Design a protein around this ligand. Structure first.
Ligand code: HEC
Ligand code: HEC
Ligand code: HEC
Ligand code: HEC
Length: 107
């Protein structure tokens, strides 16, 4: 059994880095993010080679890193996708959780 790491993890593959905290996602099952691949939940970094390693922000295939982090209608919920659902009709929360600028993701 893997262990949830400590808060303050940096997602820094790009020029727009994001801090991910596990302690704020306790309500979400590990497997919802560290999703099955070949029938087993995979705990490798999302951008591991052969994973979401296409750094072209325009790509919409499963390989696209930007895509996996931001899109709706994806096989597993994206950061933004889940956050949208979470905020509901609350404009303040929408800003905080889904804003492109001045949000909890991107200052
Ligand atoms: C989505 C909301 C997540 C849930 C729920 C959990 N984790 Fe997570 N974890 C997530 C991210 C985006 C990252 C960073 C990965 C990257 O590419 O930077 C992590 C990181 C981990 C790690 C470290 C992996 C590494 O750096 O090699 C581990 C071991 C880990 N997470 C385990 C873990 C467990 C045990 C969880 C449930 C209790 C869990 N995660 C939930 C996103 C999300
Ligand atoms: C390689 C071993 C991977 C790792 C580590 C992570 N992902 Fe993944 N992801 C991978 C595949 C092969 C696929 C398709 C799975 C399938 O059954 O089709 C996915 C899919 C996604 C999706 C859906 C994309 C879409 O529908 O267009 C998302 C949103 C996603 N993956 C996100 C994600 C994140 C946040 C991860 C790190 C915590 C991560 N994946 C790890 C391969 C691999
Ligand atoms: C649902 C399946 C989620 C997914 C996938 C991810 N996040 Fe999330 N996030 C979720 C909830 C329910 C909450 C708390 C909402 C609240 O304010 O009440 C959060 C919160 C965040 C935050 C703010 C708190 C913090 O940890 O600073 C951030 C910055 C955040 N989430 C980032 C984030 C990223 C980078 C994700 C993809 C890798 C991601 N979330 C996925 C629910 C869900
Ligand atoms: C957290 C829930 C996010 C919010 C809200 C938005 N984005 Fe994001 N973004 C997120 C992550 C996890 C990442 C990758 C971090 C890393 O560097 O590893 C990003 C990155 C970007 C980038 C960089 C793309 C590139 O140069 O490769 C861009 C341009 C970006 N994000 C744009 C963007 C927009 C337009 C958003 C509103 C719709 C937005 N982000 C919100 C997570 C989060």
């Amino acid at each position: 059994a893997p262990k949830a790491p400590a808060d303050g993890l940096k997602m820094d593959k790009t020029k727009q880095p994001v801090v991910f905290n596990h302690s704020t996602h306790k309500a979400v099952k590990c497997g919802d993010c560290h999703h099955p691949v070949n029938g087993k939940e995979n705990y490798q970094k999302c951008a591991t080679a052969g994973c979401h390693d296409n750094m072209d922000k325009k790509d919409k295939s499963a390989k696209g890193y930007y895509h996996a982090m931001h899109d709706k209608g994806t096989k597993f919920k994206s950061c933004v996708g889940c956050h949208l659902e979470t905020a509901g009709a609350d404009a303040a929360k929408k800003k905080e959780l889904t804003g492109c600028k001045g949000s909890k993701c991107h200052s």
